[PDB]
Amino acid sequence: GMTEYKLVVVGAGGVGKSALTIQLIQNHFVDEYDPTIEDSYRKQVVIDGETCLLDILDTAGQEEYSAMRDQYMRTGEGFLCVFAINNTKSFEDIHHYREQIKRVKDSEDVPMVLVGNKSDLPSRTVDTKQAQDLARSYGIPFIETSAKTRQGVDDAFYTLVREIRKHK
Numbered sequence: 001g002m003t004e005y006k007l008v009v010v011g012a013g014g015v016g017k018s019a020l021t022i023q024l025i026q027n028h029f030v031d032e033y034d035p036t037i038e039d040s041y042r043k044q045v046v047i048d049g050e051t052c053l054l055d056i057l058d059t060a061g062q063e064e065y066s067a068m069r070d071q072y073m074r075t076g077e078g079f080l081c082v083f084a085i086n087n088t089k090s091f092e093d094i095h096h097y098r099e100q101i102k103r104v105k106d107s108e109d110v111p112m113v114l115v116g117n118k119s120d121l122p123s124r125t126v127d128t129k130q131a132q133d134l135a136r137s138y139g140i141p142f143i144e145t146s147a148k149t150r151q152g153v154d155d156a157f158y159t160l161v162r163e164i165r166k167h168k
C-alpha cells in the first residue's frame with residue numbers, strides 16, 4: 001500500500017508556512033494566503049522511487065495548549081520548523097516550537113528539519129552559519145528555501161519524509 005506521511009509545518013506568523021506548502025501542492029508561489037487559515041493538504045509524490053502520500057498540516061493562529069490541540073499535534077510524524085532569514089525574531093522563536101514538539105511527542109528524537117525561508121530576499125539578518133549551528137545543536141538537517149523560486153522546497157519536505165522513514 002501507499003504510505004502516508006503526516007508532516008506539520010510550524011513557525012512564526014509570516015515566515016512562509018503557507019507559501020511553502022502551496023508551492024509543494026500547487027507548484028505556484030502565493031504572495032497572499034489568509035494568515036488565519038490552518039488546514040491540511042495532501043499530495044502524492046515519488047521519493048526515492050516510492051510513491052507516497054504526503055499529508056501536510058499548515059499551522060496557523062494563536063498558541064493553544066489544550067489537551068485536544070496537543071493530541072492533534074501528536075498525530076504529526078515529522079515537523080518543519082520554519083523561520084525567515086530576514087526576521088531575527090522568527091529564528092529566536094524556533095526553540096519554542098522545538099520544545100513544544102519534544103513535549104507533545106514526549107521524545108528527544110522527533111523527525112524534524114530546520115527551514116530558513118525567504119532565501120531569495122536581500123534583507124538577511126540571520127547568518128547561515130548561525131542557522132546551520134542551531135540545526136547541529138538539535139541534530140537535524142537545515143535546508144535553505146524560497147517559496148518564491150522553489151529553492152529547497154522538495155529538499156525540505158523530502159528530507160523530512162526520509163527522517164520519518166529512518167525513525168520507523
Ligand SMILES: C[C@H]1CNCCN1c1nccc(-c2noc3c2CCC[C@@]32CCCc3sc(N)c(C#N)c32)n1
Nearest residue numbers: 010059061062063064065069070073093096100101104
Ligand atoms: C513562539 C510562541 C511564544 N511567543 C508568542 C508566539 N508564539 C506562538 N505563536 C503562535 C503559535 C505558537 C505555537 N507554539 O507551539 C505550537 C504553536 C503553533 C503550532 C503548533 C505548536 C507546535 C507543534 C507542537 C504543539 S503542541 C500545541 N498545543 C501547540 C500549539 N498551539 C503546538 N507559538
Ligand SMILES: Nc1nc2c(ncn2[C@@H]2O[C@H](COP(=O)(O)OP(=O)(O)O)[C@@H](O)[C@H]2O)c(=O)[nH]1
Nearest residue numbers: 013014015016017018019030031118146147148
Ligand atoms: N520573497 C518571499 N516572500 C515569501 C516567501 N515565503 C513567503 N513569502 C511572503 O511572506 C508573507 C507571509 O507568507 P505566508 O505564507 O502567509 O506565511 P505564514 O503566516 O507562515 O503562513 C507573504 O506575503 C508571502 O508572499 C519566500 O520564500 N520569499
Ligand SMILES: [Mg+2]
Nearest residue numbers: 017018035060
Ligand atoms: Mg499561513
